[PDB]
Amino acid sequence: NITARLDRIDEKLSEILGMLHTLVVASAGPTSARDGIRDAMIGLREEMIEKIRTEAL
Amino acid sequence: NDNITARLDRIDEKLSEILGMLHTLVVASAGPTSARDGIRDAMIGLREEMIEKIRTEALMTNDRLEAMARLRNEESEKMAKDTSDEVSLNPTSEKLNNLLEGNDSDNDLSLEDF
Amino acid sequence: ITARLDRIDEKLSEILGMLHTLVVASAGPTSARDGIRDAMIGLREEMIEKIRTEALMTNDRLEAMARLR
Amino acid sequence: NITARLDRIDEKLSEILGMLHTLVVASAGPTSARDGIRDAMIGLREEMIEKIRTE
Amino acid sequence: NVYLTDSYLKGVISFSECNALGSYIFNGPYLKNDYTNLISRQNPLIEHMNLKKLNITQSLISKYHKGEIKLEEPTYFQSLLMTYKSMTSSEQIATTNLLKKIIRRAIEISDVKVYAILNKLGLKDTIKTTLLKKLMCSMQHPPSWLIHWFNLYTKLNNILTQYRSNEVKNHGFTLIDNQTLSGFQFILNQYGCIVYHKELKRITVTTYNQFLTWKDISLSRLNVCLITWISNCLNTLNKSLGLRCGFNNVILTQLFLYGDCILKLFHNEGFYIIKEVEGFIMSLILNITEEDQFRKRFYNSMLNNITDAANKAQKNLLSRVCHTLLDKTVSDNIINGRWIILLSKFLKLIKLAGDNNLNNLSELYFLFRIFGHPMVDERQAMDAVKINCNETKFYLLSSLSMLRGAFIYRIIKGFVNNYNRWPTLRNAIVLPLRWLTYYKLNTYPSLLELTERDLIVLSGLRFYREFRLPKKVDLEMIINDKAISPPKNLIWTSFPRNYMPSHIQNYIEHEKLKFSESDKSRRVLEYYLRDNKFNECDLYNCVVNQSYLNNPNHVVSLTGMFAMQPGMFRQVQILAEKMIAENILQFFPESLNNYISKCSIITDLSKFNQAFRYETSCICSDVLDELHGVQSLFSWLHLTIPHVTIICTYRHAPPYIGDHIVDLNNVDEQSGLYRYHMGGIEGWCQKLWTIEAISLLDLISLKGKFSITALINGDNQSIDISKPIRLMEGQTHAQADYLLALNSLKLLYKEYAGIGHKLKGTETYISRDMQFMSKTIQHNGVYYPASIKKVLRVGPWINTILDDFKVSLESIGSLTQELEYRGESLLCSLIFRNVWLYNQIALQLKNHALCNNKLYLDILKVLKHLKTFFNLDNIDTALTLYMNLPMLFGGGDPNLLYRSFYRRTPDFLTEAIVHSVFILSYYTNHDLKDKLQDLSDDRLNKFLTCIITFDKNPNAEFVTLMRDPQALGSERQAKITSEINRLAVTEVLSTAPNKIFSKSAQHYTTTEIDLNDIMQNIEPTYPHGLRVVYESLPFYKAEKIVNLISGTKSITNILEKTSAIDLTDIDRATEMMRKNITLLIRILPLDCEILSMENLSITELSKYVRERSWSLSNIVGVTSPSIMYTMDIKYTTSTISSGIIIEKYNVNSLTRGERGPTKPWVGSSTQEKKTMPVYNRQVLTKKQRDQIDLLAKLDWVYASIDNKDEFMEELSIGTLGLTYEKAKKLFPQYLSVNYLHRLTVSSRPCEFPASIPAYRTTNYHFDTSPINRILTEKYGDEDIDIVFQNCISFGLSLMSVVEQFTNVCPNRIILIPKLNEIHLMKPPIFTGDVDIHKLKQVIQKQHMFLPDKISLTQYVELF
């Protein structure tokens, strides 16, 4: 039953991760965009990274 | 293998505490600030703390008891009367209903005096 | 094996502290605020490293797909 | 085995700690922290440019 | 450079304009004590001064300032007008005789088509039909109410026509008249309307839009009475001929009178009560279609809504007229609450109008429109929005996680169902153990296997970029004939210079020198045409760099609610929407004992924009950004709108700008201006909110353990809920259904409140099983249409530019066809259309605004020509015949006979020629049930000879066939508006500051010549293949932009910043109309060997005409026989086993309004078969996929080209940027051999439905075995040119029509084809070469419109 306990703990950790991710998404609001810090919570994505890589040449 | 079980139970208790705190977390919208000069952040809190914040009008809203009853998982009066087994007639609609029923050309209407 | 569980418990305690401090900070002033929004640890480079890692992974994927040229 | 699940839990805990740090220091009020985050992101962008073009 | 005003209400009646004008005229608050009156009396307008300073206006003001006359609100005079019975004996006689003449002429005109139809179906003075003889005998004397409405419309229309003509002639003209409408005194002007009643000592000051609205109201009531009278006469003649609804004229007149009385007692706010009429009507419908609980609940909520609306209206008007000049105008029946009597009576009348019938209660939805439109206040409306858009919303983090998880689950399910793959997650470690198995095996759990835990777990997934953002902006999505908001710093330019203070004017003059001309444009087309720094990839660079965030120029402007934003914030608003329309709606297909219990819940979603905050929309828009790889493109709204200053920028509703205030962000908040709008603006991000609502409904279905079905049709949604239950003992089905409805209501109320959308009981209602989507009523598989609601506005110059004649006739025919397609009445729609066509041509033509009687003189020339040609008795008969000739040759009849039996046809020329044959059979006494033969009367012979013998003058055959593959040529067809103005549009665009448009306009003519030279060498010309070649070249986009621009008025002044029509355009349009009118005398010269009808096939004749017109040796794939002529109709037993058999499976003699057993006939077009090659299709954008499909279609159709290799190498290198062999890996492989009936382009009908409602087709069964065996014996498995679907549709529709004209639906019909009319069709071998150099020139000259190239990396990732 050790593996069962590990699986239950893993699923609870997955729920914690989902809730915290939704909180991160919902907490990156218009105040962040006015600040200019939204990309800290959101993270650089393919378009911006490609644009920078093109600029890095 | 009792110590491994005890360690797993301690970890399970910590996970249960974290999940119990998270599941009751209330998120407030990033509405306008006081005096309507600036914009506020998307603050978060516990369920009861945010309910009391609503009680202290710390977050401006057009409705209070509806939000409290929703957060407390209660049935406010507005919800109770909005969706009931029957819809109650407003007194004016009551009068309109007696007027509409019993159509007998006796409503005493005088258009030319309008 | 028990060392892994002990480190996991330490991480969970850190997570509990982090979450409680987050809730207290997001509570607002006039309740648990004397100074002007005191920094509770001060390490803001953790997300900087995390974002750098994520952007590095995405850039690596993009460059790997371009390397097929 | 047990080690695989322990490694998965370690990764999940690292992710949780990172996102919690993001939330906690993102809730900063004073302009000093905001400007520090913005300048840190600018420096990160420049470092990414240099590290990409180093080869 | 003349000004032309509207003839119908094309905008909104303005509260602010009436307030400002009436407050300046009478020097005091008129409708409201806002800032409008203060600034309209402190600093008036020049037009208002000109209105006030007239002699008659000064006399009226002097009368009022004493005062002998009393000031009233516009609605008082609306009520006064719509009851005007002060008609003298001479006026009574004049109007009665005019209406009698119009009715007689319309019936005489309709007799031609009735005779043609009755002669084809074999159902056997100026009227040769006994049916219409009886109808005219019935229709001899019009009723009194119809004469009243016709007289009122005639007088109001005469006022409008006089003003419009004399304003076109003389600028600034003000029409002062008191003779046409006895008693009333009108001072009418494009910026005002002062009405004075002398006998009652009353006066109002309203706007021009209100006079247009009064004219529209009179026309609508006249149309309702006309339709009602025609239908009642037909039904008295035969219960099947007229419409299904049986109305009473007297009751309807009483409804109009009582609605006007309600609008008079209550002021403008009275429209609120009228706004609830549908409620009552809806309740009435439920009383026939529902059980006790549902209908009682809806009736009670309806009554509560109506009376709460009445109380709100009373409170608002009493609080509004408190300090105005109308404080004495409030009736004493509003103060004491006696209105509750009158309103009751009104509702009673509606019930009497319903007559407990579903047909009447469904048709009665026109009541919203016959009472006019409310004088809309802008400040109050947007303040009401602000009340709901500043509220703070409190969210449970679990609820947000569940919503985001449901969204992500739907994304994953769509990916797996479509792409057979999970989106590549970047943090797939989150999936604990079982979701990892689902990911590795690429499978998803069903909804019934889903739990809330699973959704909260899914809420943590992040994806990789899985979709493509177009680098080069499509110019067909960002260009339109709509206004654009000026930037923030220039927002003050939306208000008149008089209404603004001195400092604002100085600031505007000093800031117009700091903004580029494109910014100061005020219109979208002018915004882009004047953009001299335009780039093809500015939109992509803006989105990638997020230049729309924290932008100082962002502002939101509310006008008639219609909101807009300056320039680039608009295109982003479209771009995001555009992406959701391609890449994400595929995942949401619905966005366009042991007893099963089912309910339905209808919710008004028009309030989503207020409810949604960032914390709700972002949790799904972020997943969308992650899929597309951008950062905050689908969430732009909530990250940009909060920081902008929402302002109502109507012309006559300025804000109070403080001393030394020039910035809109520092203006003090007030009525008409507010900030910090946390929420969505209606219309923007509508697709995202619909997607989010569907995700929520899935989550609720998970939480409620019931199967669900969503239908979100715009701003209202229908949710069908089913649950399996253990039925209680003694409980019935109705109680179980009602209990399920109540529980689901509570649950979705709880969830919607969970996202902060506090649902209101007024919006959401519950029904057992009825669905009322598409604004239509459906009961037990029977459709009840509100046809009359659409034919209300059938007037002379409807839906036209510069009062065009052909376009107005087209619109009249299209609109009046709804009484045929939906209302299910051939004769009623025919007679209504003929009434209004005769009114437009015989009467209203000599009253044109710009060419007052030039068109009437031309039409008289045409009538004399047709009298001389066809040897007609007089000009009355010439007009009757002209009215029934196709607009291809003549221009009378806009609705060909084939449209009465099937909607779509692939050959317009053959249908027109068959229509002409049938029409001329009226005069030639030719039998239509037999063959074509030469008899004594050779009018048809002369017509056909003049059709086929003509001097051929081909010119630009191939570009014309690319543009209209059905075009005739040799100047044998009426030129269209886009053809005439194309040269003018190019000359205008060539001088535009934008290099992209100017360059493409300079090369336009040369590119047209080159495009004509590309495919001139292929012998068997296929016009549809030429169309495929056309769409695959960048000239298609330039042509579409030019055609869009050519549809506007005043092309020349497009860059001149005026709203006036240049005289050049006026003259050009006049000459166009005259040439089109005289096309009938050009087509049939008096001196035009005679064609012999012995063994004549009209299919060959039409093919020869089409070939000769272009002088092309062979044209294939555009000629198809007319089904109505090909198939003779038999009603007895088929003794020869030939022809399609249509049988009636229903047992009732009458099958109208009844649903049968068989499946509905949608038309069922047979599509092409293609093996799509396997690759990562998501790597190509929509444009690239469309281009690949077009090139594959070319490879399928042009496989016989002698230089195919070079031609396709050039095409693929130019457009797609790839070599031919590299692109060939992506081309669909069309297994089908024949491309002449399986090709799919925009020039071919995608469906071939019947001319009956879909449900009706279920009553009949079609069998096409004998004709199939005969045709496959004769042709041996080879495609023919006759359309099978159209044969079936013709059979069904003529069964319906024989029921209409016979009162007994036929037991069975057989369609026996004419064999000589049917010709074999094989895909020919395209001998000849393709001009490669000319094709390269066409690609290069318009290269700026070339679709996105497929880059090397994109091809690599494509596999």
Ligand SMILES: COc1cc(-c2cn(C[C@](O)(c3cc(C(C)(C)O)c(F)c(-c4ccc(F)cc4)n3)C(F)(F)F)nn2)cc2cccnc12
């Ligand atoms: C979409 O654009 C067009 C379409 C079609 C067109 C014509 N058809 C019919 C067809 O060829 C066919 C073949 C056979 C054979 C093979 C000889 O057994 C038939 F027997 C019958 C048949 C039998 C009994 C009937 F009562 C009625 C028709 N039907 C078909 F179905 F194969 F396509 N279908 N589409 C023709 C067009 C012409 C010009 C411009 N566009 C066109």
